[PDB]
């Protein structure tokens, strides 16, 4: 069973589900809208080998960024052309990592799924390529995997980028660890 | 909890969930198969800026369409080559918008998720790049975001293209508005 | 409602849900980790027409494989360069079919969703492009659709590749057929 | 998860839950009202020994019955007094077994609970001694255990006597029997 | 699906479930304790005929009441004996209607069941004849059907008398009434 | 959501729900049958005052007990008559407290309801005065409130006396106590 708006409000009110910052107007019929942070990550390696720590570069946009499909063959000329014509702060091609502004904490009886917003899916822009299910007990912001599959797409800082859908677990889960006191 | 075939039939029978047209043979163990409409949309802009109304072209296929991966570099020669060799009515590359033939209406206690069919996923053809969850209270046909990630794929008008999975909400949702009478 | 770790263990113990081979340490708060088999499939056709039986080649890796994004333009020189530098057994570009080592059987009251692991999504590598919901009653291994969307990614035989999330059905489903005896 | 009016309607429509006879007006927010049959059973043995076959007499009423609390001492004169004053066809004291008019069949994924009617509870008349849960897979009419705890109560043939609350099972049961 | 302490707290906080008055200390693992009001109702007619309007007397107690089993034969001397020995304000035999202090309102997606307090059950005192399920959409105080089955039992004004167990409905009900 | 036979089996196997002793044959479509212990408690005070400590006598039977309705007037001759005719070890009238043989422990996500056996309900014998819901987190044997409402009923040591219906909680409870 998926939590409706009424449930989302209840759980947030009692702190069963943490959402920071929380915006009551972001609560939908059965989901909670999340927004795009201004910090992005761009990898800098020939190939990705998870056995190692990948090399990357961190950038912060003032207002917007243009995400181009892979192999868009971006040149210095094309970049300045886009920045001037569309007033974007940064221009990237291929995959780029983003983050939600929202930090969340899930209880042991709730799992959440993140999904990119439909209006962006409509222009072939995704902010997550996997199902996006999150383990009960999870604490943190949501990492976004942004990729455009047709034409370059303009994304704006703080814009609604996706939604979290909350589902009840059949039973309380062992989140992986337990803590007590002296 | 996901609705089984028995539940799907019940809800459709009592009009709790509207599906038009409805085909009882499209009801699976825990989903409902939907079909591909003959109308598609192709955007025509350098970049996609959601602040504006995107430019596009509407096409209607007589029977089939060939969807090629992005940057397939389609030329007039290649198009006629495909149309003649595979008898396809249209040839496109990159993302293309489609629609289900089916129109649905969801009650305030049901959310639905659309997923592209497995047989097509098996050939790297997707008709939705996001989770595809639909808000309770939704009314309308399903918009498809079609993209091929390996080789061109032939799609046929009216073919089963995906499935809707229905989930119960924990509580009735506020669909966003309420209506009364004089 | 999604099954928690406690439920997963219960169902596996009573054989309601079959998982072979089963590793108790693969049970998470609300999912079960699956691993990557050593056999892969690569299609060999100009276009994919589902009306026919697609041509393909089966390969078996000794330890690892390098999955490059589509149109990576792999040459014999580049392949030997990768195999020597990263010690990979095979080098492929575009979509490649894989399989989980695990074979599963789902009861008539459970549906499962497969999702690629987050650590790999983080490097733009997916092992399924659709929602990945599996019908109740399903029996078999999970077919993986592997695609890299940014840079080549190294995958290792037997590594955890994704997770199965189990959901209860609202009612028992008709899996499609029934069997009796003389 | 208790079935709401809409769910009850759905399950009856698809024959997942059988209710014969069925009246849509008996469907409440989350229950289905059942009615009192005209047939009753009165045990005639000295004590109840479940290890033995119980003797009883079958009683059928035309319109109504007066249920008196145990030890009401129903003399021959008192019974006639009650029949003429309240127009009851039969007068009994202590326990009496009745039955719903409705015959039901439950699927392997539903369990139901029978509850006596609220209005009757308020006059200390009960139609069930136990909680009233009915196994998934059950088939049959519902046996009523009628007892009055304060003063005599008149029951009418075919009157609503209680309700069935339907609950979903977490998983399908093995209704082999 | 029965609501746990955390759920009850949430539903009361957002006013999905109304409970007036409300005391957080009455919230248990999966129920909410309710208390006994000082007002009771005693029927004064010879028999219960639901087809007619019932006559009754309104009784209000200051502190406590002694509930005796039916046919306890409460002579004038016995009543005074009980009042002086147990300091009860009123002595009654057989059934007596009471009410919870708490007024509740249930949403269209919740049904509740009232259950008599365990400690009282152990002394054979019941405060409800039926299963106790309350329709989704219900509004009002809970009517108590009090009867003692073994020996007289003293009940105190405002004491915890039972509990409400809340259950989720599978779907929203049509609480038009 | 009520647990089905398969769920009960799973929860007992993983020790989520403790039942000692446990017999797989007692698992029904959606319940678990419990049995009658040989120990009973009979209160010996004039009235029940929960504000005070209750006096009682401990009774243990070898094989069976005869439960008579209240005010059955069990003279010395009547008792011997019943013992010799029905081979019962003890004869009591009114309420008697019993206990299940089974000891249980419930997890923070399950609540259980005890219900008296159907066959016994049909002979107007009840083993619980309240609805019977048991808090999540509970540990212990189940106390039985036995009362006969029609005629004397013979109960046998170790016989199935009722059943436990297990329900899932919507969320985990805070079973601190
Ligand atoms: N008030 C009642 C009483 C009984 N029954 C039904 C359900 C029971 O399963 C059946 C009686 O079965 P048994 O005669 O076999 O009684 P048992 O005690 O021997 O078995 P069980 O405990 O399963 O009822 O009748 C009913 O619908 N309403
Ligand atoms: N112990 C009780 C008894 C009753 N009620 C409430 C719920 C009932 O719906 C209402 C009584 O309604 P009616 O007077 O209309 O009784 P009816 O039998 O005629 O209708 P119903 O079967 O719906 O109760 O009072 C309650 O909260 N506690
Ligand atoms: N038939 C019964 C009666 C009681 N109990 C258990 C569950 C109760 O929580 C406990 C009795 O607790 P108390 O002695 O504290 O009774 P109280 O009324 O004071 O508290 P509570 O209302 O929680 O029971 O015994 C049981 O399993 N079966």
Q: Where are the domains of chain A?
A: 1-182
Q: For chains B and D, what is the number of CB pairs under 8 angstroms?
A: 18
Catalytic residue list of F: 145
- Please give the Cα distance from A20 to A100 (Å, whole number): 10
**Helix, strand, or coil here: E89?**
coil
Strand E125-126 relative to strand E139-148: parallel, antiparallel, unpaired? Answer: antiparallel
The residue with tokens 């089939």 is B64
Kindly compute the dihedral angle of the four CA atoms of residues B16, B17, B22, B25, in this order, to the nearest 10 degrees.
-100
- Please give the Cα distance from D170 to F109 (Å, whole number): 13
Active-site residue, selected from the candidate residues C53, C77, C105, C145:
C145
- Please give the Cα distance from C80 to C61 (Å, whole number): 16
Instruction: Among the bound ligands, name the one nearest to the CA of residue E138.
Output: 2
Residue E82, φ and ψ in degrees, nearest 5: -70, -40
- Please give the Cα distance from B59 to B42 (Å, whole number): 8
Chains touching A (3+ CB pairs < 8 Å)? B, C, E, F
Q: Are B38 and D48 in contact (CB under 8 A)?
A: no
Q: Are C142 and C100 in contact (CB under 8 A)?
A: yes
CA angle E138, E143, E146 (to 5 degrees): 150
- Chain A CB contacts of F7 under 8 Å are none
Nearest in space to E36 (alpha carbons), one of E101, E92, E129 = E101
- Please give the Cα distance from F169 to F1 (Å, whole number): 8
Q: How far is the CA of E171 from the centre of ligand 1 (A)?
A: 30
The residue with tokens 């409000």 is A9
Token pair in block for residue D69: 């609390």
Greatest C-alpha distance within chain E: 57
- Please give the helix or strand (H or E) that residue B178 lies within, else none: none
Give Cβ neighbours of residue A178 (< 8 Å, ≥ 6 apart): none
Domain E1-177 has CATH 2.70.40.10: yes
Ligand 1 site residues, Cβ closer than 6 angstroms:
D 128, 134-135, 138, 142-143, 145; F 117-119, 121-122
Kindly report the nearest CA distance between residue C148 and chain A, in angstroms. 10
Q: Is B117 annotated as a binding residue?
A: yes
Nearest in space to B93 (alpha carbons), one of B65, B57, B59, B53 = B65
Residue D98, φ and ψ in degrees, nearest 5: -125, -170
Token pair in block for residue A146: 């942004």
CB of E25 within 6 A of ligand 3: the answer is no
- Please give the Cα distance from B7 to E49 (Å, whole number): 43
- Please give the Cα distance from E90 to E56 (Å, whole number): 16
- Please give the Cα distance from A101 to A26 (Å, whole number): 13
> What are the beta bridge partners of residue A160?
A35
How far out from the chain centre does Cα B139 lie? 14
Nearest in space to F143 (alpha carbons), one of F106, F96, F107, F86 = F96
Give Cβ neighbours of residue E102 (< 8 Å, ≥ 6 apart): E19, E20, E21, E22, E34, E35, E141, E142
Give Cβ neighbours of residue F65 (< 8 Å, ≥ 6 apart): F40, F88, F89, F90, F91, F92, F96, F154, F155
Q: Are B8 and B22 in contact (CB under 8 A)?
A: no
Cβ <8 Å between C170 and B69: no
User: Which is it for the CA torsion A150, B33, B5, C178, positive or negative?
Assistant: negative
Instruction: Among the bound ligands, name the one nearest to the CA of residue E137.
Output: 2
Q: How many CB atoms lie within 10 A of CB C10?
A: 23
Kindly compute the dihedral angle of the four CA atoms of residues A56, A61, A65, A67, in this order, to the nearest 10 degrees.
10
DSSP single-letter state for residue B58: E
- Please give the Cα distance from C26 to C14 (Å, whole number): 18
Q: Mutate which of F119, F123, F163 to test ligand 1's pocket (most atoms within 8 Å of Cβ)?
A: F119
Give Cβ neighbours of residue B18 (< 8 Å, ≥ 6 apart): B12, B103, B104, B105, B139
How far out from the chain centre does Cα A42 lie? 15
Kindly compute the dihedral angle of the four CA atoms of residues F133, F135, F137, F141, in this order, to the nearest 10 degrees.
-50
Residue E91, φ and ψ in degrees, nearest 5: -125, 125
> What are the beta bridge partners of residue B59?
B40
Kindly report the nearest CA distance between residue E36 and chain A, in angstroms. 30
Token pair in block for residue B145: 């975001």
Kindly compute the dihedral angle of the four CA atoms of residues C3, C8, C9, C15, in this order, to the nearest 10 degrees.
130
- Please give the Cα distance from F62 to F57 (Å, whole number): 17
Ligand 2 site residues, Cβ closer than 6 angstroms:
D 117-119, 121-122; E 128, 134-135, 138, 142-143, 145
DSSP, residue by residue, chain D: -B--HHHHHHHHHTTSSEEES--GGGEETTEEEEEB-SEEEEE-SSSB-TTSPPPEEEEE-SSEEEEEPTT----HHHHHHHHHHH--SEEEES-EEEEEEEEEE--TTEEEEEEE-HHHHTTTEES-SS--EE-TT-EEEEEEEEEESSS-EEEETT-EEEEEEEEEBSS------
Q: Are C9 and A177 in contact (CB under 8 A)?
A: no
Give Cβ neighbours of residue B43 (< 8 Å, ≥ 6 apart): A123, A150, A151, B54, B55, B56, B95, B97
Residue E93 annotated among the catalytic residues of the structure = no
- Please give the Cα distance from F70 to A41 (Å, whole number): 81
Cβ <8 Å between D115 and E97: no
CB burial of F54-70 (b: ≥16 within 10 Å; e: otherwise) equals eeeeebebeebbbbbbb
Q: Are B75 and B54 in contact (CB under 8 A)?
A: no
Nearest in space to F133 (alpha carbons), one of E33, D59, C138 = E33
Q: How far apart are the first and last CA of chain D?
A: 24
Q: Mutate which of E41, E137, E138, E165 to test ligand 2's pocket (most atoms within 8 Å of Cβ)?
A: E138
DSSP, residue by residue, C19-82: EES--GGGB-SS-EEEEB-SEEEEE--SSB-TTSPPPEEEEE-SSEEEEEPTT----HHHHHHH
E65 to chain F, any CB pair closer than 8 A? The answer is no
Nearest in space to D27 (alpha carbons), one of D8, D11, D12, D13 = D8
Q: Are C50 and C117 in contact (CB under 8 A)?
A: no
Q: Is the peptide bond before D21 cis (omega within 30 degrees of 0)?
A: yes
Give Cβ neighbours of residue E23 (< 8 Å, ≥ 6 apart): none
Q: In CATH, what class is B1-182? A: mainly beta
- Compare all CA atoms of chain A with the CA of B99 and give the residue at the minimum distance: A122
CB of F175 within 6 A of ligand 3: the answer is no
User: Which is it for the CA torsion B114, B118, B120, B125, positive or negative?
Assistant: positive
C-alpha separations of B121 from A124, A125, C54, C72, F51 in Å: 17, 19, 14, 21, 71
Partner-chain residue, chosen from A47, A108, A130, that has the shortest CB–CB distance to C126: A130
D158: left (phi over 0), alpha (psi -120 to 50) or beta: left
Nearest in space to B165 (alpha carbons), one of B126, B137, B124, B131 = B131
The residue with tokens 């609560």 is A27
Nearest in space to E140 (alpha carbons), one of E101, E175, E169 = E101
Catalytic residue list of A: 145
Give Cβ neighbours of residue F121 (< 8 Å, ≥ 6 apart): D128, D129, D130, D145
Give Cβ neighbours of residue B66 (< 8 Å, ≥ 6 apart): B82, B83, B86, B88, B90, B91, B92, B152, B153, B154, B155, C47
- Please give the Cα distance from F167 to B107 (Å, whole number): 27
Token pair in block for residue A69: 């499909």
Give Cβ neighbours of residue A174 (< 8 Å, ≥ 6 apart): A108, C4, C5, C6, C29
- Chain F CB contacts of D71 under 8 Å are 69, 71
Nearest in space to B40 (alpha carbons), one of B18, B16, B64 = B64
Token pair in block for residue E22: 């409300």
- Please give the Cα distance from D124 to D33 (Å, whole number): 19
Token pair in block for residue F142: 């189940």
Token pair in block for residue C133: 């919901």
Cβ <8 Å between F172 and A172: yes
Q: Are B158 and B177 in contact (CB under 8 A)?
A: no
Token pair in block for residue C60: 């078996």
Q: How far is the CA of F119 from the centre of ligand 1 (A)?
A: 6
C-alpha separations of E81 from E66, E92, E154, F45, F79 in Å: 12, 13, 14, 15, 31
Token pair in block for residue D81: 């007094």
C-alpha separations of A149 from A125, A146, A163 in Å: 6, 10, 20
Give Cβ neighbours of residue F46 (< 8 Å, ≥ 6 apart): E151, E152
E69 to chain D, any CB pair closer than 8 A? The answer is no
DSSP, residue by residue, E106-168: --TTEEEEEEE-HHHHTTTEES-SS--EE-TT-EEEEEEEEEESSS-EEEETT-EEEEEEEEE
- Please give the Cα distance from E2 to D111 (Å, whole number): 15
Q: Is the peptide bond before E11 cis (omega within 30 degrees of 0)?
A: no
List residues forming the annotated binding site of C for dCTP. 117-122, 128, 132, 135, 143-145, 163, 177
Cβ <8 Å between F123 and D43: yes
C-alpha separations of E109 from A10, B138, F105 in Å: 15, 21, 30
Q: Are C161 and B17 in contact (CB under 8 A)?
A: no
- Compare all CA atoms of chain C with the CA of D172 and give the residue at the minimum distance: C172
Q: Is the peptide bond before C21 cis (omega within 30 degrees of 0)?
A: yes
C39: left (phi over 0), alpha (psi -120 to 50) or beta: beta
3-state secondary structure A123-180: CCEECCCCCCEECCCCEEEEEEEEEECCCCEEEECCCEEEEEEEEEECCCCCCCCCCC
Residue A83, φ and ψ in degrees, nearest 5: -60, -35
Q: Is A180 annotated as a binding residue?
A: no
C-alpha separations of D68 from B135, D73, D147, F150 in Å: 57, 9, 8, 11
The residue with tokens 């698992």 is F27
Q: How many CB atoms lie within 10 A of CB B52?
A: 9
Nearest in space to C121 (alpha carbons), one of A19, A138, B148, B131 = B131
């Amino acid at each position: 069973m998926i939590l409706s708006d009424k449930d989302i409000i209840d759980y947030v009110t009692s702190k069963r589900i943490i959402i920071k910052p929380f915006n009551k107007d972001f609560v939908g019929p059965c989901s909670y809208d999340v927004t795009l942070g201004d910090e992005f990550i761009i990898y800098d390696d020939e190939v990705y080998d998870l056995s190692k720590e990948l090399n990357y570069k961190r950038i912060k946009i003032k207002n917007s960024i243009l995400v181009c499909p892979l192999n868009y063959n971006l040149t210095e000329e094309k970049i300045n052309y886009f920045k001037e014509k569309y007033n974007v702060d940064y221009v990237v091609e291929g995959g780029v990592l983003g983050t939600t502004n929202e930090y969340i904490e899930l209880p042991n009886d709730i799992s959440a799924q993140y999904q990119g917003r439909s209006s962006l899916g409509r222009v072939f822009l995704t902010s997550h390529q996997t199902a996006g299910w999150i383990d009960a007990g999870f604490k943190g912001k949501i990492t976004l995997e942004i990729v455009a599959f047709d034409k370059p797409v303009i994304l704006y800082k703080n814009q609604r980028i996706g939604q979290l859908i909350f589902s009840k677990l059949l039973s309380p889960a062992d989140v992986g660890y337990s803590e007590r006191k002296t």
